[PDB]
Structures are given as C-alpha cells and as structure tokens.
Tab-separated table of C-alpha atoms in Angstrom:
chain	number	residue	atom	x	y	z
A	21	UNK	CA	-148.904	-33.214	-19.056
A	22	UNK	CA	-146.346	-32.120	-21.334
A	23	UNK	CA	-147.631	-28.503	-20.401
A	24	UNK	CA	-147.702	-27.923	-16.012
A	25	UNK	CA	-144.574	-25.736	-16.327
A	26	UNK	CA	-146.228	-23.172	-18.474
A	27	UNK	CA	-149.692	-23.670	-16.849
A	28	UNK	CA	-148.379	-23.081	-13.770
A	29	UNK	CA	-146.113	-20.325	-14.976
A	30	UNK	CA	-143.306	-21.838	-13.751
A	31	UNK	CA	-139.509	-21.203	-14.687
A	32	UNK	CA	-137.144	-24.400	-16.215
A	33	UNK	CA	-136.536	-26.182	-13.335
A	34	UNK	CA	-137.199	-29.146	-11.469
A	35	UNK	CA	-140.773	-29.500	-9.318
A	36	UNK	CA	-141.949	-32.425	-6.993
A	37	UNK	CA	-143.860	-35.203	-8.409
A	38	UNK	CA	-147.543	-35.461	-6.434
A	39	UNK	CA	-147.564	-39.139	-6.112
A	40	UNK	CA	-144.278	-40.586	-6.096
A	41	UNK	CA	-140.894	-39.294	-4.855
A	42	UNK	CA	-138.985	-41.414	-5.998
A	43	UNK	CA	-139.691	-39.318	-9.501
A	44	UNK	CA	-140.000	-35.617	-9.887
A	45	UNK	CA	-141.153	-33.472	-13.022
A	46	UNK	CA	-138.644	-31.443	-15.168
A	47	UNK	CA	-138.980	-28.177	-16.948
A	48	UNK	CA	-136.482	-27.825	-19.784
A	49	UNK	CA	-137.358	-25.673	-22.779
A	50	UNK	CA	-140.743	-25.216	-21.064
A	51	UNK	CA	-141.540	-28.710	-21.529
A	52	UNK	CA	-142.526	-30.854	-18.207
A	53	UNK	CA	-141.123	-34.789	-18.248
A	54	UNK	CA	-141.537	-36.842	-15.484
A	55	UNK	CA	-138.155	-38.327	-14.347
A	56	UNK	CA	-137.123	-41.246	-12.446
A	57	UNK	CA	-134.309	-40.236	-9.855
A	58	UNK	CA	-131.775	-42.494	-9.598
A	59	UNK	CA	-131.049	-45.549	-7.807
A	60	UNK	CA	-130.765	-44.631	-4.149
A	61	UNK	CA	-132.016	-41.184	-4.618
A	62	UNK	CA	-135.205	-39.521	-4.074
A	63	UNK	CA	-136.497	-35.807	-4.993
A	64	UNK	CA	-135.240	-33.498	-1.831
A	65	UNK	CA	-138.679	-30.703	-2.034
A	66	UNK	CA	-135.882	-28.201	-0.548
A	67	UNK	CA	-132.704	-29.093	-2.783
A	68	UNK	CA	-135.402	-29.130	-5.903
A	69	UNK	CA	-132.813	-32.093	-7.140
A	70	UNK	CA	-132.446	-35.877	-6.082
A	71	UNK	CA	-130.798	-36.307	-3.141
A	72	UNK	CA	-129.626	-39.701	-1.131
A	73	UNK	CA	-132.124	-41.317	0.003
A	74	UNK	CA	-131.521	-41.060	3.862
A	75	UNK	CA	-131.440	-37.332	3.336
A	76	UNK	CA	-135.226	-37.274	2.710
A	77	UNK	CA	-137.129	-38.244	6.094
A	78	UNK	CA	-140.929	-37.889	4.307
A	79	UNK	CA	-139.820	-39.989	1.432
A	80	UNK	CA	-140.043	-43.591	3.028
A	81	UNK	CA	-139.624	-47.546	0.331
A	82	UNK	CA	-142.169	-50.158	0.819
A	83	UNK	CA	-145.037	-48.235	1.909
A	84	UNK	CA	-147.785	-48.294	-0.509
A	85	UNK	CA	-147.493	-44.225	-0.946
A	86	UNK	CA	-143.744	-43.190	-0.023
A	87	UNK	CA	-144.479	-40.053	0.674
A	88	UNK	CA	-145.238	-39.540	3.844
A	89	UNK	CA	-145.890	-35.980	5.291
A	90	UNK	CA	-148.899	-37.004	7.785
A	91	UNK	CA	-146.729	-36.283	10.770
A	92	UNK	CA	-144.329	-33.627	9.588
A	93	UNK	CA	-145.608	-31.252	12.054
A	94	UNK	CA	-144.010	-33.546	15.319
A	95	UNK	CA	-141.149	-35.052	12.623
A	96	UNK	CA	-139.800	-31.247	11.508
A	97	UNK	CA	-140.801	-29.803	14.134
A	98	UNK	CA	-143.421	-27.481	12.458
A	99	UNK	CA	-144.644	-24.452	14.577
A	100	UNK	CA	-148.572	-23.662	13.967
A	101	UNK	CA	-150.656	-22.706	10.811
A	102	UNK	CA	-150.887	-23.746	7.439
A	103	UNK	CA	-147.846	-24.728	5.501
A	104	UNK	CA	-148.102	-25.885	2.027
A	105	UNK	CA	-147.483	-29.377	0.735
A	106	UNK	CA	-143.816	-30.332	-0.010
A	107	UNK	CA	-144.804	-32.101	-2.926
A	108	UNK	CA	-148.309	-31.230	-3.855
A	109	UNK	CA	-149.573	-27.754	-4.772
A	110	UNK	CA	-153.254	-28.789	-4.875
A	111	UNK	CA	-152.916	-30.166	-0.873
A	112	UNK	CA	-151.683	-28.515	2.258
A	113	UNK	CA	-150.312	-29.191	5.799
A	114	UNK	CA	-152.206	-27.678	8.994
A	115	UNK	CA	-149.939	-27.788	12.113
A	116	UNK	CA	-151.926	-27.851	15.745
A	117	UNK	CA	-149.267	-28.022	18.522
A	118	UNK	CA	-147.162	-30.995	16.698
A	119	UNK	CA	-150.360	-32.170	15.853
A	120	UNK	CA	-150.734	-32.874	11.608
A	121	UNK	CA	-153.911	-32.505	9.484
A	122	UNK	CA	-153.377	-33.222	5.804
A	123	UNK	CA	-155.917	-30.691	4.067
A	124	UNK	CA	-156.698	-30.445	0.065
A	125	UNK	CA	-157.804	-27.532	-2.363
A	126	UNK	CA	-161.084	-27.698	-3.496
A	127	UNK	CA	-161.543	-28.897	-7.386
A	128	UNK	CA	-159.649	-25.962	-9.467
A	129	UNK	CA	-158.250	-24.694	-6.516
A	130	UNK	CA	-154.404	-24.572	-5.669
A	131	UNK	CA	-153.183	-23.818	-2.151
A	132	UNK	CA	-151.349	-20.361	-2.637
A	133	UNK	CA	-148.366	-19.967	1.151
A	134	UNK	CA	-148.840	-16.000	1.198
A	135	UNK	CA	-153.060	-16.846	1.785
A	136	UNK	CA	-152.945	-19.854	3.825
A	137	UNK	CA	-155.532	-21.432	1.720
A	138	UNK	CA	-156.053	-22.531	-1.693
A	139	UNK	CA	-157.509	-20.188	-4.606
A	140	UNK	CA	-158.150	-20.150	-8.366
A	141	UNK	CA	-155.822	-20.560	-11.415
A	142	UNK	CA	-154.141	-17.380	-11.630
A	143	UNK	CA	-151.611	-15.927	-14.146
A	144	UNK	CA	-148.206	-17.605	-12.177
A	145	UNK	CA	-149.392	-19.946	-9.257
A	146	UNK	CA	-147.705	-23.277	-7.398
A	147	UNK	CA	-145.264	-20.102	-6.782
A	148	UNK	CA	-144.061	-21.957	-3.317
A	149	UNK	CA	-142.000	-24.451	-5.828
A	150	UNK	CA	-140.542	-21.477	-7.410
A	151	UNK	CA	-136.881	-20.696	-5.170
A	152	UNK	CA	-133.579	-21.095	-4.757
A	153	UNK	CA	-132.341	-23.572	-2.704
A	154	UNK	CA	-128.971	-22.450	-0.124
A	155	UNK	CA	-126.497	-24.568	-0.740
A	156	UNK	CA	-126.326	-28.058	0.197
A	157	UNK	CA	-124.157	-28.006	2.304
A	158	UNK	CA	-123.605	-24.708	3.454
A	159	UNK	CA	-120.434	-23.600	4.074
A	160	UNK	CA	-119.730	-20.885	7.087
A	161	UNK	CA	-116.211	-19.145	6.643
A	162	UNK	CA	-113.840	-19.874	9.027
A	163	UNK	CA	-114.226	-16.549	11.613
A	164	UNK	CA	-117.717	-16.711	11.241
A	165	UNK	CA	-117.851	-16.982	14.980
A	166	UNK	CA	-117.096	-13.651	14.739
A	167	UNK	CA	-120.272	-12.302	12.918
A	168	UNK	CA	-122.136	-10.961	15.753
A	169	UNK	CA	-120.120	-9.480	17.725
A	170	UNK	CA	-118.296	-7.709	14.916
A	171	UNK	CA	-121.224	-5.923	13.736
A	172	UNK	CA	-122.605	-5.196	17.002
A	173	UNK	CA	-126.400	-7.122	16.929
A	174	UNK	CA	-128.478	-7.040	19.521
A	175	UNK	CA	-129.000	-9.554	21.430
A	176	UNK	CA	-131.861	-12.151	19.755
A	177	UNK	CA	-132.642	-13.404	16.318
A	178	UNK	CA	-131.198	-12.520	13.193
A	179	UNK	CA	-131.197	-13.527	9.619
A	180	UNK	CA	-128.237	-15.917	8.341
A	181	UNK	CA	-126.422	-13.988	5.291
A	182	UNK	CA	-124.992	-17.147	4.268
A	183	UNK	CA	-128.675	-19.007	4.131
A	184	UNK	CA	-132.116	-18.273	3.587
A	185	UNK	CA	-133.239	-21.671	5.463
A	186	UNK	CA	-131.008	-20.653	9.449
A	187	UNK	CA	-131.079	-17.273	11.501
A	188	UNK	CA	-128.330	-16.479	13.056
A	189	UNK	CA	-128.714	-15.816	17.308
A	190	UNK	CA	-126.253	-13.347	19.341
A	191	UNK	CA	-126.232	-13.477	23.116
A	192	UNK	CA	-123.336	-12.051	25.038
A	193	UNK	CA	-121.428	-11.235	22.313
A	194	UNK	CA	-121.750	-15.393	20.563
A	195	UNK	CA	-122.760	-16.066	17.365
A	196	UNK	CA	-125.080	-19.382	16.717
A	197	UNK	CA	-126.396	-20.225	13.378
A	198	UNK	CA	-129.742	-22.362	13.532
A	199	UNK	CA	-131.499	-24.317	10.546
A	200	UNK	CA	-135.201	-23.724	10.187
A	201	UNK	CA	-137.358	-26.626	10.489
A	202	UNK	CA	-136.850	-28.710	7.118
A	203	UNK	CA	-138.715	-27.116	4.630
A	204	UNK	CA	-139.659	-24.034	6.116
A	205	UNK	CA	-137.438	-20.554	5.340
A	206	UNK	CA	-136.691	-17.416	7.414
A	207	UNK	CA	-138.646	-14.171	7.130
A	208	UNK	CA	-136.455	-11.416	7.359
A	209	UNK	CA	-139.131	-8.696	8.137
A	210	UNK	CA	-140.559	-10.434	11.147
A	211	UNK	CA	-137.542	-12.525	12.072
A	212	UNK	CA	-139.350	-15.626	12.254
A	213	UNK	CA	-139.455	-19.165	9.949
A	214	UNK	CA	-142.415	-19.923	8.055
A	215	UNK	CA	-143.414	-21.648	4.981
A	216	UNK	CA	-142.371	-18.789	2.311
A	217	UNK	CA	-139.461	-19.834	0.345
A	218	UNK	CA	-140.321	-18.069	-2.847
A	219	UNK	CA	-140.155	-14.718	-0.828
A	220	UNK	CA	-137.432	-16.064	1.361
A	221	UNK	CA	-135.387	-17.414	-0.773
A	222	UNK	CA	-135.239	-15.389	-4.603
A	223	UNK	CA	-138.219	-16.402	-5.552
A	224	UNK	CA	-139.347	-13.409	-7.089
A	225	UNK	CA	-136.464	-12.905	-9.570
A	226	UNK	CA	-137.026	-16.620	-11.208
A	227	UNK	CA	-140.501	-15.305	-12.807
C-alpha cells in the first residue's frame, strides 16, 4: 500500500517488508514503495538498510520463508519477555528461557513494544521501527579503555555513550563494552537491554 508510511505516522526512512527480508519498504516523500535489496544483500532490521547477506542471521536463503525468527530467542540470546517481531508490526515474539513463540495480534491490532502486547490503530504506531541506528560499525576512540577509570564509575553496568545497542561494564577500574543481544537496545533508566529501540535510540525526535 502506497499510503503505509502516513498510515502509521512514520517518518521518511526504511522499514521492514514483513514477508520477504530480501525486500524493504522505502518511505520517501511520505510515499511507500517496496524495494529489492541489491544482489547479495538483505534488509538488516537493526541498521534500517540493506546489508551483506551474511550479516543478517534471521534472513536465510533457499527457504519458503526467508524470514526465520522461529528460534530468535536462543539464536540472539534474548531474555524473558515479549519483544517486537523484527520484520512485522502485527506479530511479536515471546521468549521463555531461550524458547521462542511467534505470536500474532488480533485483526486490526498492532504490537506496541512499550505495552508488550497489541492495540488498535492510533495516531502514530508501529513505533518499534522508528529509531536512529548507531553507526555501523561503532568506532571507539583510542583511549576508550580509560572510560570507567576517568569517570570514576562504580562497579557494574553503565550506558555506552557511543551506542544505544551497547552497554559498559566497569570492574576493578577496567572498561568493557558489550553489545546488547541483536535487536535489543540499552535502557539507561533501568540499566538493562530491552526491546524498545524507539525509546533508547532516539525515535521520539524523528516524529
């Protein structure tokens, strides 16, 4: 549908095609067009762009459905809870100790990551696809190994100021940065990786 971008109250940008991860929805000029990624590339939900096939483990060639999220909790190490479906606003994922359930919204309902369930259409929704990706790759400055020490950070977990997909651990004055599980992002209020890229990765300012 050419009117999908405005239907969801989406900014211009790229969004997943829910049936084919070799394709994506381009919103440009507030008009939606389904486009094919160039040869050898597929839509990476976390960069919002086509990416090398080998960089997207949940998009798999030579299968009737190339979108493979049916083992995503174990494959990416998602913790327990409900998470958005990386390619489809009308489905979602339940993770229970590494076991994946693919769930669906009722007719006319759309999954809201802040709610952990589906709700009827509103005025600005499917927001789990609205975020600014961190740079790909993230480049840390030489000397980043001083971060915890120079900032006098307490032992434990802190935000990573170079990436909303990452966090920092400080132990004995040493700095480590660690990516959240793929598709998750770092909640700086609770200090945990969660499914809310809109909140953690600057989605509010895009809309």
